[PDB]
Symmetry: C3
Subunit: 99 residues, 3 copies
């Protein structure tokens, strides 16, 4: 690829990751307010955005790939958002048990 493609790739990822993040934070908000159904529904929607966001093999299939800060920003956003998706069950569960 060239930088533009890596960059546009970054943006599309930032796009999905940004949506998923919003729903996850909104889910936490819902769980905080006791609306657990909304939280679960918001989490599933976040899961959907993440599903579509989804290099190493490409780099290994030679070398290549141009450095793009936007592309790493997109990956980083996606990964930190997935980390949130991976622990949100517990945050919500702790809210339920607390209530």
């Amino acid at each position: 690829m060239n930088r533009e493609e890596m960059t546009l790739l970054g943006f599309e990822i930032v796009a999905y990751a940004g949506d998923a993040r919003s729903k996850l934070l909104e889910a936490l908000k819902a769980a905080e307010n006791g609306d657990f159904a909304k939280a679960d529904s918001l989490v599933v929607e976040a899961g959907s955005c993440i599903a579509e966001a989804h290099m190493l093999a490409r780099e290994a299939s030679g070398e290549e790939l141009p450095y793009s800060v936007t592309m790493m920003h997109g990956q980083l956003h996606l990964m930190t958002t997935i980390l949130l998706k991976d622990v949100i069950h517990h945050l919500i569960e702790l809210y339920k048990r607390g209530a």
Copy 2:
């Protein structure tokens, strides 16, 4: 910008993000110990360090979006990582603190 420049900037982001990260973790320790006022105060402080680093990151990304080619730097990558993971922690820290509050 040359690699050295990105590297220096990377250190600057690490300085602010590391500081904010320490404050957020200290706020969790505070909340864990029942000092909710200290916890909230520390988050407000972390937020100020994050805003500084975040606006710089935003500026740098827009430079690339606008066409400028930014050189690769592991230090910059490290700064971005420190900042973004720290931002995530901040985005959810209210919930970890509230949870400690309800049980305490």
Copy 3:
């Protein structure tokens, strides 16, 4: 440092971080179920995997700071990415387990 050595080290960090990550999430599942001894044991194991990958990262980063131009490595960025986010998970896991323990 060689480009080969960068990709290699990159993969090692991804492996260690991936290994630590799995244990941390398994640790969360254990705590949620009240298996605290198991949850704590997994976090200790995960911390040991993180330490090895983290010290590699510290050396790699110090090389750039000293003026060394590390070959551009996408594999290494991903190494850094997984490692740093897994460390964030470890910082958060402590509190999630403690909240579960108090709830227990």
